[PDB]
């Protein structure tokens, strides 16, 4: 990947943790918002790019 997108991608890894953990705490908050079904966050990638 390009350097700037590359180091940006690491931020995505940080963002993934951020969004994931935010979701985890949310689920933890949902531990008695008992109506909450499992909402899921899934890995993707920034798509194919010219190189």
């Amino acid at each position: 990947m390009g350097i700037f997108g590359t180091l940006y991608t690491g931020v995505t890894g940080l963002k993934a943790s951020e969004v994931q953990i935010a979701t985890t705490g949310n689920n933890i908050s949902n531990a008695n918002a008992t109506f909450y079904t499992r909402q899921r966050v899934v890995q993707t990638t920034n798509g194919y790019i010219t190189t």
Partner: protein, 50 residues
């Protein structure tokens, strides 16, 4: 039974999310120092351009 049947695959509890958090515990811990390492390395090539 059915009433009890909304607390293992659908809703919420302890542990299952906690295990997820610890994976994320690793996730950012690795991500950040990887990220800063990369930044420090940008500096190396920059000094190389010199």
């Amino acid at each position: 039974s059915v009433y009890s049947e909304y607390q293992s695959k659908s809703g919420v509890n302890t542990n299952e999310e906690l295990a997820a958090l610890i994976q994320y515990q690793s996730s950012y811990g690795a991500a950040a120092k990887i990220v800063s390492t990369v930044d420090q390395m940008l500096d190396t090539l920059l000094g190389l351009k010199s």
